[PDB]
Design a protein around this nucleic acid. Sequence first.
DNA 1: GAATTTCGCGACACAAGGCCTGGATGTATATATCTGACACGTGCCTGGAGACTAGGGAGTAATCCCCTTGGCGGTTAAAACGCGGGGGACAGCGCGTACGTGCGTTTAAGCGGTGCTAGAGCTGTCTACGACCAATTGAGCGGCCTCGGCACCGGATTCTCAGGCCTGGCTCGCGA
DNA 2: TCGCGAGCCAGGCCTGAGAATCCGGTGCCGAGGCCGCTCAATTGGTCGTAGACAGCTCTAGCACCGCTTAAACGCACGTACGCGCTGTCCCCCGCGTTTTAACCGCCAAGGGGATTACTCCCTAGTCTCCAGGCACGTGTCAGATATATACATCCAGGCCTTGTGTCGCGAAATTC
Lengths: 78, 88, 96, 98
Amino acid sequence: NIQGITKPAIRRLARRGGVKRISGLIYEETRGVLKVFLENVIRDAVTYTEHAKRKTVTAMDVVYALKRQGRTLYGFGG
Amino acid sequence: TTSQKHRDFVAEPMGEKPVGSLAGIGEVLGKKLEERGFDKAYVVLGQFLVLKKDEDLFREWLKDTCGANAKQSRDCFGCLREWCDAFL
Amino acid sequence: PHRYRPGTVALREIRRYQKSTELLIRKLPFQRLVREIAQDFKTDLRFQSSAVMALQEACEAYLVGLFEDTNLCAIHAKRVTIMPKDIQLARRIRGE
Amino acid sequence: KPHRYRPGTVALREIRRYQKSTELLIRKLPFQRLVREIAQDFKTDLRFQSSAVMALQEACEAYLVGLFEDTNLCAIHAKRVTIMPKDIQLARRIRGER
DNA sequence: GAATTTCGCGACACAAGGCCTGGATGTATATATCTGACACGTGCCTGGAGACTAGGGAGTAATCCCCTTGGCGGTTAAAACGCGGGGGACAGCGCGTACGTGCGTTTAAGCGGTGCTAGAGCTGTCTACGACCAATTGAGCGGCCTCGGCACCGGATTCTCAGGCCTGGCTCGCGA
DNA sequence: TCGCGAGCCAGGCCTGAGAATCCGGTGCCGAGGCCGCTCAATTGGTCGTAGACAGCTCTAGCACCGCTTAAACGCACGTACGCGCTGTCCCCCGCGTTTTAACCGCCAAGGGGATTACTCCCTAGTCTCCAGGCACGTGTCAGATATATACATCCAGGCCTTGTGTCGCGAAATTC
């Protein structure tokens, strides 16, 4: 489903970042990068959840998974 | 880039040009190739064609036949390839 | 007909998106992606909705920061178009 | 006739030599005086254990070496071989130190 | 037809690139010396270990309900695709200045020894200070209401990119 | 080189199409207030002890001195590479049309999150014992340091080769 990150969506994300002209090989690279980052967040979220003997990955677990890697997230705390 | 003799050879069909007219071939190498038996330009052309236009094989055969070095073989191969591309 | 030279529509889009704040990835494709990735670690996981919202906010912010740094790299090399080599350099310097 | 290497080879010899050794690369006394000078801006009359100054120097050298590795990657990115102040500023700005 | 002279041929010479060969240099390698830093033995003493107890924290079931998953029907906004084109990426070339290279000179870092005293470090006293517990009460959280700041929608008014046309100067080209 | 015809490009005037913004209206639902409650903060007393303070010891941080030489410094010189510029081409961008599946509201089921009660066993706490590991002293060999030696490597000089330019002389054209 990684092809779900539609090319116009990545174009919009770049537009937000101040990019003006985008190459063509960029899209596959961004999908790869997003796959890696999502793996590295969901692994810790799932580990936290498996620890507390729950089957629901609540919001605080995702906030903590981020908070470990240095990308503190506000607004869902919680 | 390209020697004048190379341009003169590639411009027109070889016909009956002596082997010494080839780019990268002087008097000594021309004499040696004549002594081996290759006494005409088209003979070298046919030998080049037999090797199916392979650069390494052509240069190695030329080196082993008369003692040509990298520059001479490179020039002769380039001239022959261009002649093929222009007439063949 | 009336048609802008390329580059100006890019600037209008840049200002429009830097003015607003809504999400830039359609929600359902991202939700199915999240479930697909989590399907390899635990099999029967049910995500709270707000958890997926937070995951999406984090991913968008990370990608926006990444493209900011990539754009700095691209302008460094006297270009205007980013390339995979730009992104690879940005991630290499950042420490990953 | 004189022996004189082409510009570029002595650089590579120095690169190999300094990547094979481990000794400190900044002379000790200038750095010690610099450390004391900076410290006097905050609170006067401080005394430094010698091991503390050594630790500070190790940290500074490692930081500068890392900075120059990343700056060199940035410079090679721009299809050059020289590193320039804009290279250092870009490396720092990406790293997030500024 | 003969003499002479202009265009082309071979000897003479030169220039550029490649292959062969060698010296100076630095690196690897083997052999010797020596010394101080790592490995080992030993006393002791403080921290680890064994027994036993009390109680509170976590396990586990029971129970409620909430909120997550699944599915459906409409409706669009948004994705997917294609095509024309223009501007950006990229290679290539030339220059000049700025950085590498080396050598003589200065300079101040580094090593050695000494002098000292300010302050880290350890110990003794004991007093102010924070834990703990009982009673108590008012500050703050849960729930309900309302109404107005703002989202939404429509409609003007100004702003902005683009281009088309005209004016103007510039340039090209043939003959005197 | 100028006269003069003609066209190509540079720049401004002007307008249009589309976007951004300002203005007004409606409605709507979320923020701000109000009440009931209940439990967490407050206050008072006691008591054990953490650490503030005073004092002594002795270590090491600081300052100084002199000597030697490693390294920094300044200068000159060469070249190579960063920057500027141009030409090429291809491939993202802008737009229109078609397709598709995201979004929204509604439904319903039940998986599991959260809460509470009872139970029991795991751990903090204390005492008593004892040996594992720390501080100290002592030996020896691994690596530091030197020395010479052998060899890989860098870079320049030398010689072979091809390509080319050129001038006296052969071959052919021309006039008398």
